[PDB]
Design a protein around this ligand. Structure first.
Ligand code: HEM
Ligand code: HEM
Ligand code: HEM
Ligand code: HEM
Lengths: 142, 146, 142, 146
């Protein structure tokens, strides 16, 4: 669970980096499909499963809008992300292991883009938060 | 992978005694219940929104037997598993779009169903050997994903 | 999170199998150290890190004691397992990845001993519950 | 592992530019703060009870540098990494008792600190080759645990 310390840290980092959400999202999904190509199995309905491709840029926007949603709902991620959980559960059938993969890629992207801001203390709290987001996304699966 | 004679003997012994039309349906049904995102590849099998619906589902059952017999070629090729499954890996990737993490999940369900059938005979060492074999096949099944 | 359905399933299964917790523990911890020998690193203090040894047998009773406590505290695992979390975080420093491995060995043991009781519906709820136990034991780590 | 010439070049490029005295202490401190159970082995390094203390701890810095330079032998032995690390594997198991999952955690911290240093230059392909290298070293490090 997230302490008040963790919640403040996530809020202060997102206050600093949130304006860059769309770029974070394209960078992170690009890294996921290149570095973990087995994740491309969910995007088989797309022909343009390539870094930086229009479906990847578009979709990175939606994912980091989801992260912004989660920051706004950080006091109750389960309730806050229930609709996205149901979307990934029933429609998308995404195995929750891949949330762990994307979360690592989001941390690599923020490190490349905001090295000063992504301190070790910001990192332990943001890792806890993204683990909480992955668990909340799995809420409606089973 | 380097196999000990004792691991080869355990694997041989489990597969010579396996009831495939029992274990197959149970392992796949249990996977679709415990890990329901694996239902991604089965939509037209009928309605699988229910545990009874799934365990009843004769499409699921037939597929569980087919996938369990997919293990036979590795039992017969224990030092050449990567190459033996290369074609099946390419199929699951480029034709079926199966997330290979699901191969690990079904493996765990096969292990758990086998353990319930073998009972006290599923010793720690037997579990080691059997999970070692499934782990080498699961890796092979994921190898050709690109 | 655990639904009412899940809690009833875990309580019902434990009602049936709880009598055998000690044997379950011996078997599960023996499986862990044989099949996942890297876990032996936490037991380096003991001379007999072998399956069914006195130390593993007696430890198995304690671990399953911990599971029984979790069933009793199933409506609030975080609070319920707080002391155990502190011991595993502050004294033992057990990497929480290893809770996943013991949980799989517990499921394998219950399937070998109680094949009729461990239905797929019992299994999904027990797996959700054991994941919840792992996360409550991780609560004081960071 | 099969290496492509491009992977060989990225790896050699990263290690030829690495500032070990900066990356090594940052990666190990980050591991001890993000994954505090990795402190298990370092009770005699002195003060670790909070992030500031770890970041200012010179024994942690020194060990950071040592662990990062332990990658150099695999860069030099890219087709023989498992054998090259067997004695280190045995040391970490038998004398040091380090849980090998911790190798993976530290690996991800080296990746994230390398990413902060390299910035825009840590491209997806760079990440993929670097993480592939680290995973082959981490596998070799765990190999002699029995
Ligand atoms: C950080 C965790 C994640 C966030 C917050 C997130 C959020 C979202 C959002 C907001 C949507 C849009 C749904 C709509 O259009 O109504 C979406 C769709 C989707 N997500 Fe996720 N996602 C997560 C991780 C992933 C993962 C790891 C994968 C698979 C590897 C995945 C695969 C998909 C796909 C296949 C779609 C459908 C988009 C399309 O139809 O093109 N998501 N996600
Ligand atoms: C132990 C792991 C697995 C083995 C050994 C295996 C084996 C096979 C075999 C031998 C085939 C038939 C190939 C052919 O038609 O020539 C099959 C097909 C396929 N399996 Fe897998 N499989 C495994 C796991 C799974 C998983 C985890 C799923 C999905 C969650 C999956 C989904 C499919 C589907 C949908 C087909 C396509 C059938 C068709 O279109 O004819 N497999 N598998
Ligand atoms: C189901 C998950 C687990 C539960 C509920 C649990 C439970 C417990 C309990 C109740 C104790 C106290 C025993 C005493 O009073 O001596 C114990 C201690 C201990 N546990 Fe855990 N544990 C779990 C998983 C793990 C795992 C995965 C490991 C390591 C791989 C671990 C390593 C230890 C060690 C080393 C001790 C101290 C043993 C001694 O020196 O006597 N535990 N655990
Ligand atoms: C990429 C991963 C790593 C590499 C390449 C590596 C390499 C090394 C090397 C080269 C040494 C010196 C051996 C000697 O004394 O002869 C060593 C020592 C040691 N390592 Fe690792 N290591 C790694 C990960 C870790 C991790 C993750 C931990 C613990 C969290 C760890 C804890 C230690 C300890 C406790 C020692 C001995 C400390 C001392 O006596 O100074 N290592 N390691």
């Amino acid at each position: 669970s997230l302490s008040d310390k963790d919640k403040a840290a996530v809020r202060a980092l997102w206050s600093k980096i949130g304006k860059s959400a769309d770029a974070i999202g394209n960078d992170a999904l690009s890294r996921m499909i290149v570095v973990y190509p087995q994740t491309k199995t969910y995007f088989s309905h797309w022909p343009d499963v390539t870094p930086g491709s229009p479906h990847i840029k578009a979709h990175g926007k939606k994912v980091m809008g989801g992260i912004a949603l989660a920051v706004s709902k950080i006091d109750d991620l389960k309730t806050g992300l229930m609709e996205l959980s149901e979307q990934h559960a029933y429609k998308l059938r995404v195995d929750p292991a891949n949330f762990k993969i994307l979360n690592h890629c989001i941390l690599v992207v923020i490190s490349t883009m905001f090295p000063k801001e992504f301190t070790p203390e910001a990192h332990v709290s943001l890792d806890k938060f993204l683990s909480g987001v992955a668990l909340a996304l799995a809420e409606r699966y089973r | 992978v380097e196999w000990t004679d004792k691991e080869r003997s355990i694997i041989s012994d489990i597969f010579s005694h396996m009831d495939y039309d029992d274990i197959g349906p149970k392992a796949l049904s249990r996977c679709l219940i415990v890990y329901p995102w694996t239902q991604r590849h089965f939509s037209g099998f009928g309605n699988l929104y229910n545990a009874e619906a799934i365990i009843g589902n004769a499409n699921v059952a037939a597929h569980g037997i087919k996938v369990l017999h997919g293990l036979d070629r590795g039992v017969k090729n224990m030092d050449n598993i990567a190459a033996t499954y290369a074609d099946l890996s390419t199929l699951h990737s480029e034709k079926l779009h199966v997330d290979p993490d699901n191969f690990k999940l079904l493996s765990d369900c096969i292990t758990i169903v086998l353990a319930a059938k073998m009972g006290h005979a599923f010793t720690a060492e037997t579990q080691g050997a059997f999970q070692k074999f499934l782990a080498v096949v699961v890796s092979a099944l994921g190898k050709q994903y690109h």
